[PDB]
Amino acid sequence: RIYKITVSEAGAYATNKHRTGYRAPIRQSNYTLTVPYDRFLPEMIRLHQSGAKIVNVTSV
Amino acid sequence: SRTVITEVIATADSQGRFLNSTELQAAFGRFERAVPAIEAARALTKNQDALVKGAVQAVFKKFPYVTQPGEKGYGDSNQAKCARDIGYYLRFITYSLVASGTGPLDDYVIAGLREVNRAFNLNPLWYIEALNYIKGETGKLLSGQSKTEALLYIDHAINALS
Amino acid sequence: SRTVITEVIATADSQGRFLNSTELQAAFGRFERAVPAIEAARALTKNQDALVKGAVQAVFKKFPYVTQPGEKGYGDSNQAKCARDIGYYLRFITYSLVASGTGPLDDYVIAGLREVNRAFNLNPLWYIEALNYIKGETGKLLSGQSKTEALLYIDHAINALS
Amino acid sequence: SRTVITEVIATADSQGRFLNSTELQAAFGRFERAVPAIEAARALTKNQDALVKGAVQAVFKKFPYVTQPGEKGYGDSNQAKCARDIGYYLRFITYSLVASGTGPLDDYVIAGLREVNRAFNLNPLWYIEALNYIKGETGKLLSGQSKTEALLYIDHAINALS
Amino acid sequence: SRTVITEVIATADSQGRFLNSTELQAAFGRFERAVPAIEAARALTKNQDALVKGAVQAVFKKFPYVTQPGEKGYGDSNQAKCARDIGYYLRFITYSLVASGTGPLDDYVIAGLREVNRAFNLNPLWYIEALNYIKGETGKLLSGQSKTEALLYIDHAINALS
Amino acid sequence: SRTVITEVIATADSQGRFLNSTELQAAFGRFERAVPAIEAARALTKNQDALVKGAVQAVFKKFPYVTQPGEKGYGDSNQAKCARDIGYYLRFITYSLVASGTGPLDDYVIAGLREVNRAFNLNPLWYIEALNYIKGETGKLLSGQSKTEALLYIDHAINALS
Amino acid sequence: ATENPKVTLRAPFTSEEFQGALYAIYRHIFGNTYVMESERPTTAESQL
Amino acid sequence: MNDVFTRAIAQADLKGSFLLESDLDKLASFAKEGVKRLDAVAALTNNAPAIISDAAHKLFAEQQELIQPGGNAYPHRRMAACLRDMEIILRYVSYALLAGDASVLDDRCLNGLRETYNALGTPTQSVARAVQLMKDAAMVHLKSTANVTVGDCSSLYSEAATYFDKAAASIA
Amino acid sequence: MNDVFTRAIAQADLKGSFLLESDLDKLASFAKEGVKRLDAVAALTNNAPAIISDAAHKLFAEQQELIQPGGNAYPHRRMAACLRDMEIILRYVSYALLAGDASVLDDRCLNGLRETYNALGTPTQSVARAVQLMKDAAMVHLKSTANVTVGDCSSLYSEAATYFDKAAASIA
Amino acid sequence: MNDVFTRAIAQADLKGSFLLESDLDKLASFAKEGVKRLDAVAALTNNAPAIISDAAHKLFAEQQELIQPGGNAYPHRRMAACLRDMEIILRYVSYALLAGDASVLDDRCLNGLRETYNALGTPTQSVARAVQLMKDAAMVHLKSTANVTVGDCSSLYSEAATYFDKAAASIA
Amino acid sequence: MNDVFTRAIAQADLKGSFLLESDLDKLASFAKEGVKRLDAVAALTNNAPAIISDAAHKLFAEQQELIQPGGNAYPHRRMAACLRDMEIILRYVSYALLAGDASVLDDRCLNGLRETYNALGTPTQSVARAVQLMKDAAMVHLKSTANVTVGDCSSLYSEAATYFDKAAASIA
Numbered sequence A: 001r002i003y004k005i006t007v008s009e010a011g012a013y014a015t016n017k018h019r020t021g022y023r024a025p026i027r028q029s030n031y032t033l034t035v036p037y038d039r040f041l042p043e044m045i046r047l048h049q050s051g052a053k054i055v056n057v058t059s060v
Numbered sequence B, C, D, E, F: 001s002r003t004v005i006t007e008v009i010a011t012a013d014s015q016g017r018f019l020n021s022t023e024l025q026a027a028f029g030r031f032e033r034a035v036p037a038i039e040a041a042r043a044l045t046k047n048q049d050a051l052v053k054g055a056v057q058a059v060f061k062k063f064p065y066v067t068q069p070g071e072k073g074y075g076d077s078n079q080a081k082c083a084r085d086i087g088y089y090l091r092f093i094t095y096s097l098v099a100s101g102t103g104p105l106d107d108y109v110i111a112g113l114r115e116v117n118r119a120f121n122l123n124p125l126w127y128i129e130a131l132n133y134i135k136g137e138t139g140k141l142l143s144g145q146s147k148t149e150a151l152l153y154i155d156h157a158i159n160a161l162s
Numbered sequence G: 001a002t003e004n005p006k007v008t009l010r011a012p013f014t015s016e017e018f019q020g021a022l023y024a025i026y027r028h029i030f031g032n033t034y035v036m037e038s039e040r041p042t043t044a045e046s047q048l
Numbered sequence H, I, J, K: 001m002n003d004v005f006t007r008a009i010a011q012a013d014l015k016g017s018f019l020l021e022s023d024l025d026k027l028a029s030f031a032k033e034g035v036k037r038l039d040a041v042a043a044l045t046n047n048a049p050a051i052i053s054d055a056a057h058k059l060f061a062e063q064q065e066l067i068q069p070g071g072n073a074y075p076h077r078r079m080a081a082c083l084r085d086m087e088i089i090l091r092y093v094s095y096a097l098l099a100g101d102a103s104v105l106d107d108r109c110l111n112g113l114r115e116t117y118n119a120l121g122t123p124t125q126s127v128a129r130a131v132q133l134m135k136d137a138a139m140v141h142l143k144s145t146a147n148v149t150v151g152d153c154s155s156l157y158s159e160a161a162t163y164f165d166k167a168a169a170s171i172a
């Protein structure tokens, strides 16, 4: 099954970008990621390590 | 903020395992040396006003031209902002001492420092001289390993400015 | 460098296509604006000595605190290096005018600018003042489109400094 | 769409920088070339009907078998479709002339062209010959630089088809 | 090429595993279908010259204009190239029948078909007509499952050409 | 759930193409090999009770120590769990037989096997001996190709355990 | 290293950015090897 | 994704029991009819350009508004996207036909196609009409008695019609 | 993106007929004042750091709650983000000035900037005031007749103020 | 990747000629013995853990120096790598046996394996000995008469020995 | 990748000198004839399919061994790659004619091309022949006096010939 994750980039991520920098272009904070079930755990834990805060995870 | 306990947790989480003896050793090492860092923090927090004023005067002495009409030193609000800036630097030094990590300094001064200084045309050498005075004073305000803690943090800030 | 012809060709290549109308019109604009640009380069090259010595003197006037012993500007070697640096900036500005793109300025001055200045503790405001003087003198040496071209490249360098 | 100005702005935004000498020179080339291009668009808009009629008849002379019953060009509906398609091409050529960019032709004709013609079995050589006829009467209709602009846009269309 | 045994081994290899029951069942179906497939390949190899000549004649009947002077089918060299091409398609259909897959067709005809046909202005509809004739005639020959095996590959070629 | 048909569909979908000769022959082989696998499924479903009880007894014979107290085999609850587990294995092997694919086993037993056996301390040699028992029984309950199907799926399950 | 720009494609984009981005993607990911038209993934770029 | 055999296994596992003889003999009968299914799938595949061309020809006969300026199939780009979508839906219908269940069609072709078309401005009614015309052409090509042995496959015809109608109903 | 020429072409294509003489005349006038437009864009570009610094100084003197600890721009990183946001807004405004179309500013930035500022906790009226101060600072440089030939550019000032106030109202 | 069929086809295409009748009869043979080939491949697949275990026991009984400290199979990391390499080589041998051509082994498994092993420090002679031991173990299972109809499989035994020998010679 | 201006600039930089008067004069001459250069680039770009078609036809008429089974352009794949190569070399020659410096060819078009051709087994002699044929076909369109003002464009013809020759010499 596919799971759509609406992640809001917040101050926890902004601090990390302020320290490490922007090796990639700056982007809006709110975007949605679509994952399979196999990938849902790694992608979600990765978003946590990046400091991003998920808003809603919807199944499809 | 990159406290050593925080870095322990982050590394263990990144490698996805529990806390093995390796980072327990580091957490212990922090927990023992918390005492010198905390006493250095208390000593700094007591003598804060004298340190701020002496840093300001050292800045004006090393850079006499700044205070003259037409540039940054002139204007009483500018000396007020100078005192406030050395106060901020000292405050985050105390934070980094009490937290046993450069985290407070990193995320409250160093992060975004160069762009701010460039945009407001503030010379980092002013603050380097102020922190040099603070280091000279804390060389005698503290003794023992607390002095080493304070000097490491003050010089981390100094190297950040340069 | 990032001149009009080269960026045209590079973007055409990165998309695997020939040169279309857009690119050819950009190149035509470049070949037309060559005339004012080459004229500005001639004017500045003929007058490089007066321009550079005046810029050095303007810097020493707006920064009196530099010439005295104990800091950067004191000594024949340091002032010679001042004149050499401003000669570099003016050379690369004339190169930009000849090439009709900031490519020479970017590659030779702007890339690595802040790190080099920080390493050698060279205040960008010095070179901003020198370039402001050169801008003022080109206001008098040049007229029409030549002045606009020269000022455009000088302002590009100044914005890169600040 | 792909204009000179849009290429300017996208190249500037992609590198996160302002518009500068090379980009303003490209825009100046666009503004200089606007006069022949707007003139050619005007002259082509006047004579759209004669151009389209001639192009359709040109195709019919060049590919006589197409008009044969059981083929594509047989029937008034198919010939009306032919005239509509040649009118489409001519209109997008005029748009491209006005915009000083092949963005209109690209977006509205070229993108998807091969697959659509493959699906409907539309021989590109028909449209190539029709555009050849239009190119022929552009020489008579237009002279100067408007002539060259119109011819280069028509050649862009023909290169896309071929 | 991509024949049944090869997709079998390829999937096992990419997944880093031995061949399981599914893989061997696909292989077993392949080894059954080898009998009518090689029978069809034998029949097509035997009757190649008549099939090629008939397909060329069918092309010239469907598109008579091709043989007019100045057209792609004018002359003896052009029509010899026609015969060579139809022989090519027949050869690769027999290869695909033998190998039980579209690997030979995919690798020696379809890969690069559109670009080549566009560069030399070869109409795919000619090859559609030739392959339609080969289909009609292999209907007369090749009773049974051999017919279905042949038509599968003829249709793969035709679907590629469209 | 990977089967012959599922791999057929997955490949053609990943490539973005219609199902063609190759995977149609693969599906044909699967359909032909369905009937012996189907009636082997009949056979194992019919005799499920005797096979489960015999496999349990074979395990408790090859590992007598598990029976005595302080081990995993002591208790009626543990015994019922043994019978339940062997029944699960048999049910999923019949599912693989009817599905003509290893997908049911991979999805319902093999995935997560080692982790939970380590977590619940379930020695894989117990189930390996049970599956070897069932292998001995299907050696006699089935004849012909169905014997081979049952043996392949059982020993695939064994290899997954070993 | 220096001359070719970094190709970035956000979700809102126009036609030329999309076409150039796909050219760069295919010229990088697939080696520098030619990818014939029968190999181009159409559903994948529709999803993109 | 899922199959008819895997559908039956899913029901068996949720029930928690073995496969019953009724479902199992149904699966055996499906296995025998699998050859008719192979002919149906090959009939769909060998004629995909013809089905698509006929469907699009009559679709743009009925609805001029799509191909006039301002239509949703107007520029070559949108027309190409249209024909690509026709190709995609037919391909997934053939997959569903071969599998025996309409699982793959929904799970891959039709998860979010409706709101995609809504956001893009594509009239879902015309898409469903195109899928219906595709069903008509595909049924024409499935009935062919030439080049295949004669028999009854009305089960296949019904199942394929249901797949086409399910895709069209998911569109709009 | 979209330009004024591109906008006119789009409108003509929606009705599917050639650009009218009035449209061609307006676009010819636009190309005639293109030189003045280039000067205005160069004026915005060549003094962009000065514009940012003046706007920031006036804003922070106006609103000290951002400077003081606990404010939305207190630490160095939040100050740097403040300056970077002002800079990027100015850059997009100059893009709109050069193109003559507000699409380059409206498309990528202003649509999601609302949600971004709401999520981060920034005071939106503060950012709108920052953009207004940027406009006020930039008008002086746009007016500066030194080094350019004396002429009238009231249309350019009106359009630039339009872009500035539009971005400020969007973020507001 | 090539099998016997694609190899014959490539050879014929090199001279631009159809497949001769001799080649067709050879391929029809290969297809007819395809079922015996499938049983050989299944024997290799299903008995793989036993093959590798027996090979490992023999090899590390002959060659103690591998499993001593300082040997190339000493820690669990290196011993796991040893067993992994053995299973991978056996896997590719079975792939080649099903294919009837040895090209998959040469292209994938043995492409630069000798240089890899020389680089890592592995005794390629010991790897070749392990492959020979795996061949000896595999022939036992290949010759298993149980669970299969009796028949002649001498050619398949020779072919499997040929692929094992190819692997052993290429490695060392 | 340089143009003539950047090449002059690089030499002047190495000397540490401003550009001499004569250098500026040669550069003003180059830019003053830039219109003819743009016309020649347009002639190369606009007729590129014709150039490649004619070169290809002549090359495969001369060298039939390329298109015989076993030749280097035999199947469709190799022929398509060959035509792409001609397309690419013509593209880069047009880039060099626009810039006026042949640095783009050796930096990009001919960077590792000879090694590529050697490793693939491509006959470099036939590639150089193809480039010469393209040069001949291109000269026809460069001298085409229709639609352009009559003038002396011999420097452009010689420069383009040298670019084609530099290619065909770097491959060969």
Ligand SMILES: CCC1=C(C)/C(=C/C2=NC(=C\c3[nH]c(/C=C4\NC(=O)[C@H](C)[C@H]4CC)c(C)c3CCC(=O)O)/C(CCC(=O)O)=C2C)NC1=O
Binding pocket: B059, B066, B072, B073, B078, B079, B081, B082, B083, B085, B088, B089, B108, B109, B116, B120, B121, B122, B126, B127, B130, I057, I060, I067, I073, I074, I075, I076, I079
């Ligand atoms: C918590 C982290 C933090 C720091 C460190 C900080 C420093 C700081 N001081 C400032 C003002 C200033 N700061 C100075 C400092 C000078 N005064 C002179 O007496 C000395 C030579 C010299 C000090 C050694 C001056 C002259 C100004 C006014 C000019 C300006 O920057 O706008 C500004 C510009 C905006 C403002 O007024 O706040 C910053 C960012 N702000 C922060 O939020």
Ligand SMILES: CCC1=C(C)/C(=C/C2=NC(=C\c3[nH]c(/C=C4\NC(=O)[C@H](C)[C@H]4CC)c(C)c3CCC(=O)O)/C(CCC(=O)O)=C2C)NC1=O
Binding pocket: D059, D066, D072, D073, D074, D078, D079, D081, D082, D083, D085, D088, D089, D108, D109, D116, D120, D122, D126, D127, D130, H057, H060, H067, H073, H074, H075, H076, H079
């Ligand atoms: C905006 C850009 C655009 C173009 C250019 C365009 C061309 C175009 N012409 C078409 C039909 C057609 N067009 C022709 C034209 C032929 N008639 C013969 O007399 C001539 C030899 C020849 C023209 C030179 C014909 C015969 C058809 C019918 C094809 C069919 O029924 O399948 C179609 C198929 C859909 C339809 O119109 O019903 C397209 C897409 N469509 C576009 O959206």
Ligand SMILES: CCC1=C(C)/C(=C/C2=NC(=C\c3[nH]c(/C=C4\NC(=O)[C@H](C)[C@H]4CC)c(C)c3CCC(=O)O)/C(CCC(=O)O)=C2C)NC1=O
Binding pocket: G032, G033, G034, G035, K066, K072, K073, K077, K078, K079, K081, K082, K083, K085, K086, K088, K089, K108, K109, K110, K113, K116, K120, K122, K123, K126, K127, K130
């Ligand atoms: C920087 C610009 C650039 C160039 C120049 C370039 C050349 C180039 N040509 C190639 C292949 C080729 N090139 C040719 C062309 C030759 N064979 C014919 O006989 C002709 C005589 C002759 C051409 C006139 C052929 C046939 C191949 C395919 C080789 C093969 O498939 O074995 C390849 C290998 C790509 C692949 O097959 O995946 C490259 C990289 N690539 C680039 O990115």
Ligand SMILES: CCC1=C(C)/C(=C/C2=NC(=C\c3[nH]c(/C=C4\NC(=O)[C@H](C)[C@H]4CC)c(C)c3CCC(=O)O)/C(CCC(=O)O)=C2C)NC1=O
Binding pocket: G043, G044, G046, G047, H066, H072, H073, H078, H079, H081, H082, H083, H085, H086, H088, H089, H108, H109, H110, H113, H116, H120, H122, H123, H126, H127, H130
């Ligand atoms: C996962 C499988 C998959 C599906 C199902 C798929 C369909 C699909 N069609 C699309 C667009 C489209 N689809 C159509 C076709 C419709 N409009 C016409 O009027 C017809 C009536 C009708 C077709 C019969 C058109 C014209 C567009 C372009 C919309 C636009 O860009 O404005 C899009 C949006 C992206 C794009 O513009 O290409 C998707 C995702 N893509 C996939 O990867």
Ligand SMILES: CCC1=C(C)/C(=C/C2=NC(=C\c3[nH]c(/C=C4\NC(=O)[C@H](C)[C@H]4CC)c(C)c3CCC(=O)O)/C(CCC(=O)O)=C2C)NC1=O
Binding pocket: E144, E145, E148, E152, F021, F024, F025, F028, H035, H036, H038, H039, H040, H042, H043, H142, H143, H144, H145, H148, H149, H150, H151, H152, H153, H156
């Ligand atoms: C390689 C892919 C492949 C194909 C193409 C294939 C066709 C195929 N069709 C068959 C029979 C059949 N095929 C059909 C289906 C047809 N009957 C018509 O009325 C319908 C229009 C149509 C359904 C779409 C029927 C009804 C049979 C008879 C079943 C029997 O033989 O008992 C058979 C078995 C008997 C034989 O033909 O020798 C095969 C192998 N099998 C394959 O593995």
Ligand SMILES: CCC1=C(C)/C(=C/C2=NC(=C\c3[nH]c(/C=C4\NC(=O)[C@H](C)[C@H]4CC)c(C)c3CCC(=O)O)/C(CCC(=O)O)=C2C)NC1=O
Binding pocket: A010, A011, A013, A014, A015, A017, A018, A026, A027, A028, A029, I066, I072, I073, I077, I078, I079, I081, I082, I083, I085, I086, I088, I089, I108, I109, I110, I113, I116, I120, I122, I123, I126, I127, I130, I131
């Ligand atoms: C498309 C172009 C684009 C824009 C416009 C954009 C705005 C933007 N501003 C941000 C944060 C911010 N933005 C501001 C600026 C505002 N806050 C107030 O203090 C000021 C008065 C005012 C400036 C005028 C500040 C202070 C932050 C830091 C918030 C935080 O770190 O918690 C962020 C979060 C990322 C980060 O902090 O690293 C984004 C994405 N991003 C983009 O990609």
Ligand SMILES: CCC1=C(C)/C(=C/C2=NC(=C\c3[nH]c(/C=C4\NC(=O)[C@H](C)[C@H]4CC)c(C)c3CCC(=O)O)/C(CCC(=O)O)=C2C)NC1=O
Binding pocket: C033, C148, C149, C152, D021, D024, D025, D028, I035, I036, I038, I039, I040, I042, I043, I142, I143, I144, I145, I148, I149, I150, I151, I152, I153, I156
């Ligand atoms: C290298 C990049 C580049 C720049 C910078 C450029 C600017 C430029 N400004 C010009 C004059 C001008 N510039 C302006 C604009 C000014 N007039 C008022 O003082 C305003 C305050 C101010 C606008 C902000 C005007 C009105 C003209 C005269 C145009 C006319 O009415 O004919 C001209 C025409 C000079 C002539 O041929 O006589 C150019 C080409 N062109 C370029 O290719």
Ligand SMILES: CCC1=C(C)/C(=C/C2=NC(=C\c3[nH]c(/C=C4\NC(=O)[C@H](C)[C@H]4CC)c(C)c3CCC(=O)O)/C(CCC(=O)O)=C2C)NC1=O
Binding pocket: E021, E022, E024, E025, E028, F033, F144, F145, F148, F149, F152, J035, J036, J038, J039, J040, J042, J043, J142, J143, J144, J145, J148, J149, J150, J151, J152, J153
């Ligand atoms: C699911 C995967 C799958 C398998 C495993 C499979 C095996 C398979 N083995 C077969 C017979 C056979 N198998 C063998 C091989 C044996 N001869 C010697 O005893 C050797 C020890 C041994 C080789 C390992 C032989 C000789 C036959 C009889 C075929 C003949 O005599 O022509 C047959 C033909 C029908 C039969 O006689 O039962 C099949 C289908 N088919 C499949 O679809």
Ligand SMILES: CCC1=C(C)/C(=C/C2=NC(=C\c3[nH]c(/C=C4\NC(=O)[C@H](C)[C@H]4CC)c(C)c3CCC(=O)O)/C(CCC(=O)O)=C2C)NC1=O
Binding pocket: E056, E059, E066, E072, E073, E074, E078, E079, E081, E082, E083, E085, E088, E089, E108, E109, E116, E120, E122, E126, E127, E130, K057, K060, K067, K073, K074, K075, K076, K079
């Ligand atoms: C192995 C796969 C393969 C194929 C299929 C293939 C086809 C092929 N045919 C060609 C020439 C040709 N082929 C034809 C075929 C036409 N003759 C007419 O009588 C008919 C209407 C029609 C055939 C039905 C023609 C006219 C040419 C000459 C085209 C030209 O000279 O430009 C060419 C161009 C190079 C040459 O051979 O001279 C190719 C690539 N080449 C391959 O390597």
Ligand SMILES: CCC1=C(C)/C(=C/C2=NC(=C\c3[nH]c(/C=C4\NC(=O)[C@H](C)[C@H]4CC)c(C)c3CCC(=O)O)/C(CCC(=O)O)=C2C)NC1=O
Binding pocket: C021, C024, C025, C028, D033, D148, D149, D152, K032, K033, K035, K036, K038, K039, K040, K042, K142, K143, K144, K145, K148, K149, K150, K151, K152, K153, K154, K156
């Ligand atoms: C949109 C891109 C663009 C192009 C392509 C372009 C071409 C262009 N060709 C021109 C005339 C010319 N074009 C040529 C070149 C031709 N003479 C023939 O004999 C040769 C076959 C051939 C090359 C030697 C010459 C010699 C002139 C006149 C001399 C000159 O303008 O300096 C001119 C000058 C107008 C004039 O003074 O009459 C331009 C600007 N301009 C553009 O903005």
